[PDB]
C-alpha cells in the first residue's frame, strides 16, 4: 500500500510473560502505550505527553475485548499452539565508542514468537542489574515480535559484554558477544 | 514448551497524497483470519478460521458503518494532530570519522530515516570499496548508519565524508588527514 506514513494501533493478549500490551506506533516507532497493572498512558518521549493525551481506558477496554476473542479463538482453533520461532540477536553501541565517554549498549532481539523472553546483561561474566532499560514487545508486519534492551556503560578495554537471550524456540540461551 | 495461546490485532492508518486508508486485522498466533479494509468496505475472512467471524460482523450494520468512518474519525484526526511532533520531527545527525585499513564515517542520532552519505578523496567522489550498513533503528526515535571506505593511505591525501539530510540545509563534512 502506497503510504507516506503509517500510524498503527497494536495490541495482543496471551497466556504467559506479558498477558497484555496496548501500544501505538508511528513509522515503526512506539509513541505511547497503556501500562496495564498501573492503568495510565506512558509516553516514550516526555515531549509527547506535553502535546497530546490518551484515554488509557481505551487500551484496557480493547485488551478485555481481545481477551474474550482469545478464548473464543482458543475453542474454535482446537487448542492449537503456534510454532516457537527463534530470535536473531545483535549488539551495537548507540554512540561511537570512546574510552571514558558514557555510551549506551543496544541489544536488539528480532523475529521471534511468542512474546515470551528472558533478556539479561552480563559484564565480565557477572549480572548487571543497574543502568538497564528495555522496550516493549514491538510488533512486526509478519506478526512476529522484536524488542530492544539498553545498557548504559563506560567503554573500557578490560570489559567485555554479553546479551543473554532466552526463548522457547532456542535449545540453550543465546550469548551475543560484544567488546570495544 | 508450556501451554500458550496468543490473540493480536492491528488498527493501521495509511496516509498518502492526503488520503487515509484503514485496515483492521484480527490475528490468532501469527495467522490473520479476519480483516476489514476501508477500500473494501466490509469484513472478509482471510482464512477458513475467520469465516464465521466475518459473516457475523457483516450482518451488524452499525459495525460496518463505524469502521467506514474510522479513516476520517481516527486516521485523519491523529495524522493532523501528530504533525508537528511526528511528521515534522527533525533531529540533526552527528558525524564522526575514525580509522578503526578502512575509514569509518559514523552518523548517529537522527530521526528522518532518509539519508545519504558520500565519500570524497581530494574532491573526488569514491564509489569502489564503499561498504555501508543498513538503517539502524535505535528505538529512541533515532537512527544510525556506518559507511566504510577501503583506502590506500597516501601522505597529503584528504578524505572527506559529507552527509546530506532532510534536517540540514547545508551538507555537513568531516575530514581525515
Amino acid at each position: 500500500i502506497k503510504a507516506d506514513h503509517v500510524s498503527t494501533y497494536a495490541a495482543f493478549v496471551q497466556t504467559h510473560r506479558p498477558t497484555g500490551e496496548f501500544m501505538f506506533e508511528f513509522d515503526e516507532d512506539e509513541m505511547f502505550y497503556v501500562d496495564l497493572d498501573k492503568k495510565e498512558t506512558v509516553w516514550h518521549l516526555e515531549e509527547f505527553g506535553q502535546a497530546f493525551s490518551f484515554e488509557a481506558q481505551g487500551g484496557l477496554a480493547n485488551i478485555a475485548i481481545l481477551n474474550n476473542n482469545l478464548n473464543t479463538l482458543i475453542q474454535r482453533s482446537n487448542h492449537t499452539q503456534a510454532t516457537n520461532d527463534p530470535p536473531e540477536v545483535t549488539v551495537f553501541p548507540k554512540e561511537p565508542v570512546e574510552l571514558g565517554q558514557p555510551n549506551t549498549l543496544i541489544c536488539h532481539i528480532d523475529k521471534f514468537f511468542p512474546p515470551v523472553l528472558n533478556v539479561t546483561w552480563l559484564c565480565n561474566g557477572e549480572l548487571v542489574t543497574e543502568g538497564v532499560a528495555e522496550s516493549l514487545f514491538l510488533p512486526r508486519t509478519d506478526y512476529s515480535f522484536h524488542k530492544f534492551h539498553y545498557l548504559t556503560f563506560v567503554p573500557s578495554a578490560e570489559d567485555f559484554y554479553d546479551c543473554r537471550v532466552e526463548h522457547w524456540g532456542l535449545d540453550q540461551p543465546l550469548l551475543k558477544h560484544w567488546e570495544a | 514448551t508450556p501451554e500458550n495461546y496468543l490473540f493480536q490485532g492491528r488498527q493501521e492508518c495509511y496516509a498518502f497524497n492526503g488520503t487515509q486508508r484503514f485496515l483492521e486485522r484480527y490475528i490468532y498466533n501469527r495467522e490473520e483470519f479476519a480483516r476489514f479494509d476501508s477500500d473494501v468496505g466490509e469484513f472478509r475472512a482471510v482464512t477458513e478460521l475467520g469465516r464465521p467471524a466475518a459473516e457475523y460482523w457483516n450482518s451488524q450494520k452499525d459495525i460496518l458503518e463505524e469502521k467506514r468512518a474510522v479513516p476520517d474519525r481516527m486516521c485523519r484526526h491523529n495524522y493532523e494532530l501528530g504533525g508537528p511532533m511526528t511528521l515534522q520531527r527533525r533531529v540533526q545527525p552527528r558525524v564522526n570519522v575514525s580509522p578503526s585499513n578502512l575509514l569509518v564515517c559514523h552518523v548517529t542520532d537522527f530521526y528522518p530515516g532518509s539519508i545519504q552519505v558520500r565519500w570524497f578523496l581530494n574532491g573526488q567522489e569514491e564509489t569502489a570499496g564503499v561498504v555501508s550498513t543498513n538503517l539502524i533503528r535505535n528505538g529512541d526515535w533515532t537512527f544510525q548508519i556506518l559507511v566504510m571506505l577501503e583506502m590506500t593511505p597516501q601522505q597529503g591525501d584528504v578524505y572527506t565524508c559529507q552527509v546530506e539530510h532532510t534536517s540540514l540545509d547545508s551538507p555537513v563534512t568531516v575530514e581525515w588527514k
Binding site: 494501533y9 495490541a11 501505538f24 497530546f52 493525551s53 490518551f54 484515554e55 481505551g58 487500551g59 477496554a61 480493547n62 475485548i65 481481545l66 474474550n68 476473542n69 473464543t72 479463538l73 | 490485532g9 488498527q11 483492521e24 484480527y26 479476519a34 464465521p52 467471524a53 457475523y56 460482523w57 459495525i63 463505524e66 469502521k67 474510522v70 474519525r73 481516527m74 484526526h77 491523529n78 494532530l81 501528530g82
Partner: peptide, 12 residues
C-alpha cells in the same frame, strides 16, 4: 489535545 482510538469487535 487528545488522540482518538477504536473498538476492536467481538468474535462469534
Amino acid at each position: 489535545t487528545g488522540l482518538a482510538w477504536e473498538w476492536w469487535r467481538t468474535v462469534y
